[PDB]
Design a protein around this ligand. Sequence first.
Ligand SMILES: CN(C)CC(=O)Nc1ccc2[nH]c(=O)c3ccccc3c2c1
Ligand SMILES: CN(C)CC(=O)Nc1ccc2[nH]c(=O)c3ccccc3c2c1
Ligand SMILES: [Zn+2]
Length: 199
Amino acid sequence: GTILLDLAPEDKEYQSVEEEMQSTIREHRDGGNAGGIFNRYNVIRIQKVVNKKLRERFCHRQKEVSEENHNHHNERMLFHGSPFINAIIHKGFDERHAGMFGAGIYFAENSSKSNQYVYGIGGGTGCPTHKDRSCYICHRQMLFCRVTLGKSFLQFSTIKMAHAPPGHHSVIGRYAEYVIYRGEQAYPEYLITYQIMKP
Ligand SMILES: CN(C)CC(=O)Nc1ccc2[nH]c(=O)c3ccccc3c2c1
Ligand SMILES: CN(C)CC(=O)Nc1ccc2[nH]c(=O)c3ccccc3c2c1
Ligand SMILES: [Zn+2]
């Protein structure tokens, strides 16, 4: 089963994660409709997900991807926002639940892009209690994941792909969207509990 390790704010790891989250907020085309209006987050807690089965699957896939990618994982730390975080942290990512670049699991370099998906597509109906996509009260959660990109395929138009192209392990689609077609190519490393803050 999954254990959550609670990172202390004094930890360098907690600070590194928070700074990656704080420095990657950007203005979105929808003017904050999906994710809300804010310039910074209030990080409530940062937890590390430890699950032996999930780590074994991620490690097993990494090795396979490595052989087909000049002995490189091409691992990147990326954000993922989802209303299904609880399922992700206990069962791992599952592509069977999966778009612009087809049936994959999507990751972003910008935490504010992942924040737009925390309550669903287009931010859904926002938070459960206030039905507010820009809620400053309710605690949100997002993941900061280890993603095995391997040999990325660069896509520049919308395409409904089922799997990465032959000899490739991921799609970087065009801001860039990082897409994997196998759940075992991402590990939900950090679970971030936060609030968006009113400017
Ligand atoms: C068919 N689409 C309406 C489904 C969809 O977009 N699902 C989905 C669901 C969750 C998503 N989470 C993210 O963090 C993200 C980051 C960059 C780009 C997309 C996502 C993302 C996308
Ligand atoms: C009935 N459904 C609305 C429930 C559902 O979709 N649950 C669910 C449950 C687990 C999920 N796990 C994922 O890795 C994932 C990745 C991209 C998009 C969705 C998921 C995901 C979704
Ligand atoms: Zn709320």
